[PDB]
Amino acid sequence: STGSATTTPIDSLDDAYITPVQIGTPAQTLNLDFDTGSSDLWVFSSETTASEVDGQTIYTPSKSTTAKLLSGATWSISYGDGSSSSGDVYTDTVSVGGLTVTGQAVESAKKVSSSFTEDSTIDGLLGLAFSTLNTVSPTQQKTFFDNAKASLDSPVFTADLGYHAPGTYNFGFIDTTAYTGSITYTAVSTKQGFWEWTSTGYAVGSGTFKSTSIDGIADTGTTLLYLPATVVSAYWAQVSGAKSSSSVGGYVFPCSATLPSFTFGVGSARIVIPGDYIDFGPISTGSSSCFGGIQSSAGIGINIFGDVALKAAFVVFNGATTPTLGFASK
């Protein structure tokens, strides 16, 4: 089998991407944030504290003939940005882009933190990291991908995120029309439960490439590109007036700037992030200070190849017995 679904930016900045997902019988369609940095499929629901729901579409398990309470199971998750959610668990039929999994763990939120409430466009998350990070207790549950894997034509999914435009998540096949040149594959460590890999270096604008190993994760659920302070300083030093602002919470730059591109290495290959992808706009409405899309990972404890980087590439998440990551230009 295969599946193919369109993923759409939630706003004009590409702060995140939503993908329609069918849950239950008859189908209830929720727009979920596909997150290769976590491993829980959780949804706003009829059980979510009413004051914490503001415009989201909810899953109502009592209206699904295929929903079953997973008795005794609870979940609770905290993300890197400090947001969180928790609740209980149902199993139900879940379909993405025509690909169906029966008996999928659907984690029903009883509580969500303010950032989730305030984002009316995101009805939940669909985790695509390794199932060892799943938070369901006392019986850990599998991700949608893990459950689908054995039925897929090939044990892969791909992320093709757009810049200010829709893109595609495919399951079970590589669309050879969706990228240019060849795909370069690189080793993955699953030790921390992430799609963790090592970039071979970087360049700033038309500058020379610096060969250096940068360990990090491919994370569709993180907006920006978080890299070591040395790398980030070298980037922003090429933008007149750019500075790190403790009050704002990272690098900012004059909105009048033209940003240089940023290149990252994948083996001997190179992915170029255009300068425009690095512009996240005014820090506050009407400001002439703009927020940068490349930020320091210092104090995160991990480098994160988030949407800023991934949307510059066609990305293969290869879930074969020895997982790997592939990157192509597009």
What amino acid positions are annotated as catalytic residues? 35, 199
Closest CA to 149 of 323, 1, 306, 289: 1
User: What token pair was written down for 318?
Assistant: 């290869």
Rounded CA separation 282/190 (Å): 37
Sheet of 262-266, strands arranged across = 269-273, 262-266, 196-204, 210-218, 303-305, 225-227, 294-296
Rounded CA separation 148/142 (Å): 10
- Give how far Cα 142 sits from Cα of 49, 53, 103, 192, Å: 26, 27, 10, 16
The single-letter DSSP state of residue 15 is -
- From the CB of residue 242, how many other CB atoms can be counted at a distance below 10 Å? 20
Would you say 174 and 155 are in contact if contact means Cβ atoms under 8 Å apart?
A: no
List all residues 6 or more positions away from 28 whose beta carbon is below 8 Å from its beta carbon.
22, 57, 59, 60, 63, 64
- Number of residues in the chain: 330
β-strand partners of 225: 294, 305
Residue located via tokens 């992808």:
277
| Burial of 201 (C-beta count, 10 Å sphere; 0-12/13-18/19+) | middle
